Amino acid sequence: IIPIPADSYTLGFIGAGKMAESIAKGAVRSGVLSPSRIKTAIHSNPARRTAFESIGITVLSSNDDVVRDSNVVVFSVKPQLLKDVVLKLKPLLTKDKLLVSVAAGIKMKDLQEWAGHERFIRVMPNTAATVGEAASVMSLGGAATEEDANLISQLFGSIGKIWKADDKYFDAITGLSGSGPAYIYLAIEALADGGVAAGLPRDLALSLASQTVLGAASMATQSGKHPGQLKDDVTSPGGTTIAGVHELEKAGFRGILMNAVVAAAKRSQELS
Amino acid sequence: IIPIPADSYTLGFIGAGKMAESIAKGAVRSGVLSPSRIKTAIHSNPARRTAFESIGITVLSSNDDVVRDSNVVVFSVKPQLLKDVVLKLKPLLTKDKLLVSVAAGIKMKDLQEWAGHERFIRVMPNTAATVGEAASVMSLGGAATEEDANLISQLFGSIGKIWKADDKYFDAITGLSGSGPAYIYLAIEALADGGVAAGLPRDLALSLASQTVLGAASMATQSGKHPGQLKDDVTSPGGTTIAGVHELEKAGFRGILMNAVVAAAKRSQELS
Amino acid sequence: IIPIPADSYTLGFIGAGKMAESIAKGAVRSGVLSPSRIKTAIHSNPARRTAFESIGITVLSSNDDVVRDSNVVVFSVKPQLLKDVVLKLKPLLTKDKLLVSVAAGIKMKDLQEWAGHERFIRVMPNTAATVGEAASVMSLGGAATEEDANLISQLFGSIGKIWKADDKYFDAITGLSGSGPAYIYLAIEALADGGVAAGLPRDLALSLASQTVLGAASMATQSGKHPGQLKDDVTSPGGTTIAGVHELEKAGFRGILMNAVVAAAKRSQELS
Amino acid sequence: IIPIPADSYTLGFIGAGKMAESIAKGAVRSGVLSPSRIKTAIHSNPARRTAFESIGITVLSSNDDVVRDSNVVVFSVKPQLLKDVVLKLKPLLTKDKLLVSVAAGIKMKDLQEWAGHERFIRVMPNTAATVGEAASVMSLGGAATEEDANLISQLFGSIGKIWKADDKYFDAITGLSGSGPAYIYLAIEALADGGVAAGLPRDLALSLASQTVLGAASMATQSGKHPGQLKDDVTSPGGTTIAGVHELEKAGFRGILMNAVVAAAKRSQELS
Numbered sequence A, B, C, D: 001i002i003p004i005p006a007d008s009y010t011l012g013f014i015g016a017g018k019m020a021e022s023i024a025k026g027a028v029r030s031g032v033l034s035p036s037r038i039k040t041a042i043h044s045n046p047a048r049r050t051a052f053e054s055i056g057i058t059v060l061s062s063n064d065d066v067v068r069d070s071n072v073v074v075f076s077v078k079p080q081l082l083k084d085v086v087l088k089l090k091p092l093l094t095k096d097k098l099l100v101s102v103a104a105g106i107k108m109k110d111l112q113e114w115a116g117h118e119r120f121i122r123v124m125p126n127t128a129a130t131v132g133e134a135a136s137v138m139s140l141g142g143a144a145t146e147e148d149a150n151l152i153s154q155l156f157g158s159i160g161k162i163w164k165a166d167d168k169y170f171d172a173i174t175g176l177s178g179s180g181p182a183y184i185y186l187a188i189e190a191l192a193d194g195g196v197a198a199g200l201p202r203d204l205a206l207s208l209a210s211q212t213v214l215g216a217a218s219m220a221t222q223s224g225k226h227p228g229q230l231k232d233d234v235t236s237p238g239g240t241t242i243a244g245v246h247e248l249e250k251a252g253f254r255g256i257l258m259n260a261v262v263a264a265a266k267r268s269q270e271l272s
């Protein structure tokens, strides 16, 4: 377990997919990595080659070469393909290379078994990586060092926010930050529909819906306030806001969102 | 005649409130205005005076003086106080000065009647002005010019996004972008409570909830995609996301949000 | 595994039922097959004799002879009868003949085991085959070739649309395209009942209901748009459409249809 | 009242919109008339010019000229613009010219008052005009003749189906065939979501959903059967279909669609 050179390490992606692309772009954009320090290899899809090459990244001809040339290897294939991919690469997965998985639903215990060592970090990002606003969580394998963690924190800091948590929380994380964006997509559409139902033009209703949600979440992120206090701040006496909030409460809105997180988390567990 | 000099105009706030402060800070930060080009007056509050003075803004002793010294006058008092305030200032409200109201629920027909002329713009911003992420909409009085509009765009573009709409849409705008942030504060708290119900630590649950909402709304704002399509992009077959979405649909989640916007809009009309 | 001659192959139906009749009529109508290239046999209903004979198709006296004279054999008996039928014919089911099942709920693993070889394609069509608007899906056995697939694509393309999917999706397919037509028959009656409730004559209400459904689905099939975008296109501000849509959303309409598909898919699995 | 020559009349569109374009294309496609017998004029956008010119239709410079050159004039501007457009053209609206409105929500009494005569036909088409599957209904003004009606039937027969009804039914028509497509778009999306919830790939689920609806509506339109008979035909005993239909019936699916039509029809009346 030699420390990974924090300022000069090379990064490899196994699986040149959307998430790999988002991470690469973020890391380049933030200056955490240069394109020359990133490698990947292309599978069945040739559309992908151009996506990486156009960022200045070298696309190699095999996964094996990506691993050989990389200090840090990110596995970003679909979860059901990961075990076979790791097993095939295993002879190259020496302990001087930090391994990372972004695969949804694959536990650290399994990752470590497959690779044959514990210098492994699991991350669960989410779809907003594409715009640099991912909610990501990492868990550390048994031999991942504090410096390894910092390196991954910096890397995933370049596509959003990143927190640390024990692996046993990941089903619930998956139901909240992994699946949650869809809940909000429904909400944005419904808010827009609501605006139209109240007489707004569609384009304006949808623009307002998206920015309202963006603004409110920015307030929650930056204000240092409890969401209840934020709600209190905007509910003027007898006003329009409390009229709307009351309709939400009549319908058990909060409990419906709780139900969605719980059901998604339970599904995550069932798929394990 | 008498276009307002786009690069040198002076701006006055009548009502040195939170919203006035947010607009002033934004305009300064963006370089649209310098502090020396902004004036306000404080009705009673010492705390308010230090808030403006600490960003370099001169606090005068009367509303009358703010009006005299300003090319553009923003009325940012509470709506129930606005009529008397405008009536008292009326002799000073000459047609060479562009007037702006941010007052919730006050229609353009009334603003113009109170002032005695039609060189008036109404804006409805929202609470996210504080973090530069307002959703704002403007409507033009009968003598507001295109250059007047541009000036107001630039100004409210400094604190979020700004759109234009007919005054008749404003009750619905109020129920959507004005009131919507509370609906999202509920959502954020509920999502966090869900995460805790699913076994997450509270701090992590809340951090994830807020950033999940922020990221999803950023995807909606940047992607160019319909929210349906964004939901399609994240609902993998038989996966955790579609499980959660299905719970939301069982409960009529979308309709509840529609209800809230509709109720808030109807409250707006009733108050008007 | 000799290629089936694409332009001259003969087709045999085992089970001279309604589905067989719809496939035969389609294939003849489209010019994919001529009647002289199609054979079937009755076992114990001679009324079926006249239905094939009247479209110019020869009706043989035994299933055995249909098989001998055919390059492609379609099994269109009731599912609970299929195994014994295939077992009886087995000595004649040589690998030069492509086998096809349209039997609901019978998996490829079983088809192949019964026949003793893997040159087998499963199709799940639906009721709209009768009017050349089936939604069909095919899965390929282990020895079905790409050319076999193309042949079956062209055949079932004559009674509607035909997609390819893995056999493991067929319970869900059965709940959606197999059972879905009933959901829409309910919808059509309900829309007609709604029109009558709103004061329309029954004959007009039913005509409008059916054609409204037809037109909307044709839009969805041709437009290249997401259904949400299509909904957005027709929901004018504060207008009649959004008022109707809002009543759907209040009631959880979407979730009810999701429930139906999920229940039907589960039932399919249980009947497995 | 001079008959409009049936085989040589010229047709003018006032408002070179989407619906005008659909009608023009349909009529040219079906051979009802040649492009040389059609005229329109262009307003705010010159993008429209090319849409008409590219099908061989002459685009004139004024509404006035379109009217002068046309025996049959179709008004296809947005409803809120129609009154002023008709009043401006009124001196040219001589009784030898058959007038037609496709405007949503504009009653025959008003049309006739604006034009100053009763040789007017109202049509309510729907969004599926774009694919030639409109559900349309016409009503006759007090001086519209049987031959005028036949001419308009033939014309609107080119973009779908066309029925006749008294003007007093048009609110309800609007809530059913006018607004109904959105109810079906919801249904298509929800069906697809259901498929996905049951484990289907999204692309397949959406393809199946759309074609399932199309095919069921085609069965309703062509079979001659009551929808209840059609539902009986596919609900095999104890099978997947009846399981899904039972879930719909548990939830009051039929009533929800009735509610949508009734609400949309009431809204139509309220707007009128």
Ligand SMILES: NC(=O)c1ccc[n+]([C@@H]2O[C@H](COP(=O)([O-])OP(=O)(O)OC[C@H]3O[C@@H](n4cnc5c(N)ncnc54)[C@H](O)[C@@H]3O)[C@@H](O)[C@H]2O)c1
Pocket: A014, A015, A016, A017, A018, A019, A020, A041, A042, A043, A044, A045, A048, A063, A076, A077, A078, A079, A081, A085, A102, A103, A104, A124, A125, A126, A127, A128
């Ligand atoms: N996309 C997201 O928003 C998101 C969020 C959280 C987690 N994840 C995880 O990220 C991973 C990928 O997600 P995606 O959306 O990037 O998938 P994707 O399908 O875009 O990329 C997958 C890539 O892997 C390639 N591949 C397949 N087999 C391979 C092999 N044997 N060797 C090398 N490459 C191979 C595929 O060709 C494809 O390019 C998954 O594990 C998913 O759970 C994604």
Ligand SMILES: NC(=O)c1ccc[n+]([C@@H]2O[C@H](COP(=O)([O-])OP(=O)(O)OC[C@H]3O[C@@H](n4cnc5c(N)ncnc54)[C@H](O)[C@@H]3O)[C@@H](O)[C@H]2O)c1
Pocket: B014, B015, B016, B017, B018, B019, B020, B041, B042, B043, B044, B045, B048, B063, B075, B076, B077, B078, B079, B081, B085, B102, B103, B104, B124, B125, B126, B127, B128, B129, B178
């Ligand atoms: N704050 C928001 O998020 C938000 C959003 C949309 C619209 N608005 C509109 O902004 C306006 C102000 O909102 P706020 O939240 O800034 O109010 P605020 O109460 O923080 O500040 C209002 C100021 O007006 C001062 N005032 C009272 N009487 C006065 C007078 N006669 N002359 C001069 N000043 C006087 C008060 O002392 C106070 O400082 C309201 O009309 C509100 O509807 C605010």
Ligand SMILES: NC(=O)c1ccc[n+]([C@@H]2O[C@H](COP(=O)([O-])OP(=O)(O)OC[C@H]3O[C@@H](n4cnc5c(N)ncnc54)[C@H](O)[C@@H]3O)[C@@H](O)[C@H]2O)c1
Pocket: C014, C015, C016, C017, C018, C019, C020, C041, C042, C043, C044, C045, C048, C063, C076, C077, C078, C079, C081, C085, C102, C103, C104, C124, C125, C126, C127, C128
């Ligand atoms: N009908 C549809 O719309 C539809 C839709 C999807 C799938 N399918 C599948 O199509 C198949 C046939 O459906 P149908 O509706 O045509 O049935 P059907 O009953 O009309 O025809 C079945 C025929 O098989 C004959 N038969 C019974 N035992 C036989 C044997 N041993 N040898 C030869 N013929 C025999 C019967 O006399 C009957 O004529 C079924 O497996 C069904 O699941 C039908």
Ligand SMILES: NC(=O)c1ccc[n+]([C@@H]2O[C@H](COP(=O)([O-])OP(=O)(O)OC[C@H]3O[C@@H](n4cnc5c(N)ncnc54)[C@H](O)[C@@H]3O)[C@@H](O)[C@H]2O)c1
Pocket: D014, D015, D016, D017, D018, D019, D020, D041, D042, D043, D044, D045, D048, D063, D075, D076, D077, D078, D079, D081, D085, D102, D103, D104, D124, D125, D126, D127, D128, D129
């Ligand atoms: N589009 C549909 O599916 C549908 C369905 C039912 C009824 N309708 C009715 O059809 C009519 C048009 O619908 P659309 O969707 O075609 O509208 P659209 O906006 O595409 O076309 C309207 C056209 O009118 C033009 N216009 C504006 N002012 C004008 C003027 N003074 N003189 C001439 N042209 C002018 C606009 O530039 C635009 O090109 C509306 O009345 C609508 O209710 C449409």
Ligand SMILES: [Cl-]
Pocket: A234, A235, A236, A237, A239, A240, A241, A242
């Ligand atoms: Cl409020």
Ligand SMILES: [Cl-]
Pocket: B234, B235, B236, B239, B240, B241, B242
């Ligand atoms: Cl998922």
Ligand SMILES: [Cl-]
Pocket: C234, C235, C236, C237, C239, C240, C241, C242
């Ligand atoms: Cl509408």
Ligand SMILES: [Cl-]
Pocket: D234, D235, D236, D239, D240, D241, D242
């Ligand atoms: Cl069934």
